[PDB]
């Protein structure tokens, strides 16, 4: 959910 | 892809690249472009040990290349029935376009359904770098009681692991160390259940059978929770 795609 | 989606990809390139307008004008319509071979989907002799098959599966996934274009080419709805995701995996082998981490997980499942002595389970990571959070996922695997992984990442050490780790904890701690080397702090690990080998199964993938809060658990309870998850999967 939270955060951008690594 | 349709004409509007194509223009969106190039418009996005213009913003995320230093000379983004220049890149499109050199590539779009160019008649001298390299012809990219369509990667051969690997098939397996029954005499080939499963770890060797996994090397070939990972090699195929790598040949598609990590998608750095900024546009994901296959939409993955994670709650779709497995049979729908396997139809999509087949299309990925047909279209042969670059992929990112979640697409690689779906592909890895598709390409190992022929291996009933291998169990496959998703492992997602939440990490912290430079004030911000990042999400990653790989396909955990278990062969003959040892753990490894398949997947795709921008970094060599955040995807493929040969199935040699004697415990799930050791596999996950290897990822944690790799993240540490590139200055990411591992915050959460979310581990799924074993995925059916039936590509026509109507059941969903279970992505978050365990959600492990790394800092709140501490070292020893993190390890014990990983070993509990491994037990849940074996039974």
């Amino acid at each position: 959910e939270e955060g951008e795609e690594y | 892809m349709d004409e509007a989606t194509w223009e969106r990809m190039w418009k996005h390139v213009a913003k995320i690249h230093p000379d983004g307008e220049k890149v499109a004008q050199r590539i779009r319509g160019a008649t001298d472009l390299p012809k990219i071979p369509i990667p051969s989907v690997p098939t397996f002799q029954p005499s080939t040990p499963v770890p060797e098959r996994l090397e070939a599966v990972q090699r195929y996934i790598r040949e598609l290349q990590y998608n750095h274009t900024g546009t994901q080419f296959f939409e993955i709805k994670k709650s779709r029935p497995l049979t729908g995701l396997m139809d999509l995996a087949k299309e990925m082998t047909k279209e042969a376009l670059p992929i990112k981490s979640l697409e690689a997980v779906i592909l890895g499942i598709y390409l190992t359904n022929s291996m009933p002595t291998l169990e496959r389970f998703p492992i997602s990571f939440k990490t912290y770098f430079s004030g911000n959070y990042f999400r990653h996922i790989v396909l955990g695997v278990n062969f003959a009681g040892r753990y490894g992984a398949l997947g795709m990442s921008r970094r060599e050490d955040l995807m493929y692991k040969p199935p040699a780790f004697r415990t799930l904890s050791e596999l996950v701690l290897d990822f944690e160390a790799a993240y540490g080397r590139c200055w990411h702090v591992l915050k959460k690990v979310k581990l799924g259940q074993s995925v059916s080998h039936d590509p026509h199964s109507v059941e969903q993938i279970e992505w978050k059978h365990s959600v492990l809060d790394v800092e709140r658990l501490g070292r020893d309870d993190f390890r014990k929770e990983l070993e509990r998850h491994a037990r849940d999967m074996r039974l």
């Binding site: - | 892809m1 590539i27 390299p34 290349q65 990590y66 670059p98």
Partner: protein, 31 residues
């Protein structure tokens, strides 16, 4: 003949797009 003509055009469209995708991917990979 008409469906064979459409299939040829749709395959050509995908092949041209795929080549530009990989040319773009190399540029972005090396950025």
């Amino acid at each position: 003949v008409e469906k064979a003509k459409q299939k040829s055009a749709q395959q050509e469209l995908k092949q041209r797009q795929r080549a530009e995708i990989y040319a773009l991917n190399r540029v972005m990979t090396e950025l």
